[PDB]
Amino acid sequence: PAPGEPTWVDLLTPDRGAALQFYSALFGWEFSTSPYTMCRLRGREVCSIGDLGENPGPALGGWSSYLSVDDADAAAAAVPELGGAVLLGPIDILAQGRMLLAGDPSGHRVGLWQAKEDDGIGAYTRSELLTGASATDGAFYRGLFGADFATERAAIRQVGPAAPSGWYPCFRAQESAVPAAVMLGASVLLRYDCPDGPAVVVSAPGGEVFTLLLT
């Protein structure tokens, strides 16, 4: 796993049961019928879905993207020098690896995962950053991962002031998944083009946002 490569996405939601119904109906994910649910397709783990804990107030579930780093401590030392912020960690994760949470110069949050060790419809293909400051953010991420970063797995897309911004997971899909998701109660926020096909940014009924990569 190259540095900066998208390696995992995780959904934290205040209604996990509804999220499982929605994403199983949209992507066909399987989970056996615990604080989290592993989502599988074609015998492979795709992602996980977990609970936002009991809260005395409203709560907004969102997808959390993780990019690979070779050394979480070096990444933590570099983040502030590149104009970002360390929000949590570096922290060890039960021998899975070492995790840090980082903010880029614009305040977009991203997980950085130092691991101690599929493509096809419904698979997690990558995460993309939607940003109104692609030059500032881009310099940050290329200083952290290298000059090749965000050149054509991860990508950086320029968006206007009214679009969602931040890192969003991209799941492979057919054109027909768009009405499917709308019929399931999702709302399309934006349609843009990538080298490998159109992308549709979607707000799920729970309000979390993800991208359908139509290929």
Known binding residues for Zn(2+) = 208
Closest residue by Cα to residue 35 from 57, 55, 70, 11:
11
Taking CB under 8 A as the binding criterion, the range among 121-129, 133-141, 162-170, 174-182 that sits at the site for a second copy is 162-170
Rg (C-alpha) for the chain, rounded Å, is 17
Question: In what side-by-side order are the strands of the sheet with 124-131?
Answer: 155-158, 124-131, 166-173, 209-214, 197-203, 187-194
3-state secondary structure at position 87:
strand
d(CA 11, CA 24): 14
Residues of each annotated binding site: 208
Q: Identify the residue among 139, 164, 184, 196 touching a second copy (CB under 8 A).
A: 164
- Regarding 102 and contact with a second copy (CB under 8 A), the answer is no
* CB nearer a second copy, residue 121 or residue 132: 132
Q: Identify the residue among 150, 201, 204, 213 touching Zn ion (CB under 5 A).
A: 204
Report the run of H or E that residue 197 belongs to, with start and end.
strand 197-203
Structure tokens at 39: 């989502």
- Regarding 111 and contact with Zn ion (CB under 5 A), the answer is no
Taking CB under 8 A as the binding criterion, the range among 41-49, 160-168, 179-187, 190-198 that sits at the site for a second copy is 160-168
Provide the 10 A C-beta neighbour count for residue 68.
Answer: 20
Q: Identify the residue among 4, 62, 84, 111 touching Zn ion (CB under 5 A).
A: 62
Indicate the Cα dihedral angle 75, 150, 189, 203, nearest 10°.
-40
- Regarding 58 and contact with a second copy (CB under 8 A), the answer is yes
Report the run of H or E that residue 183 belongs to, with start and end.
helix 177-183
CB of residue 23 vs a second copy: minimum separation in angstroms?
14
Q: Identify the residue among 6, 20, 47, 64 touching a second copy (CB under 8 A).
A: 64
* CB nearer a second copy, residue 86 or residue 121: 86
Interacting residue ranges for a second copy, rule: CB under 8 A? 12-14, 52-53, 55-64, 85-89, 91-92, 107, 109, 164-166, 168, 203, 206-209
Residue numbers of the site for Zn ion (CB under 5 A)?
A: 22, 60, 62, 204-206
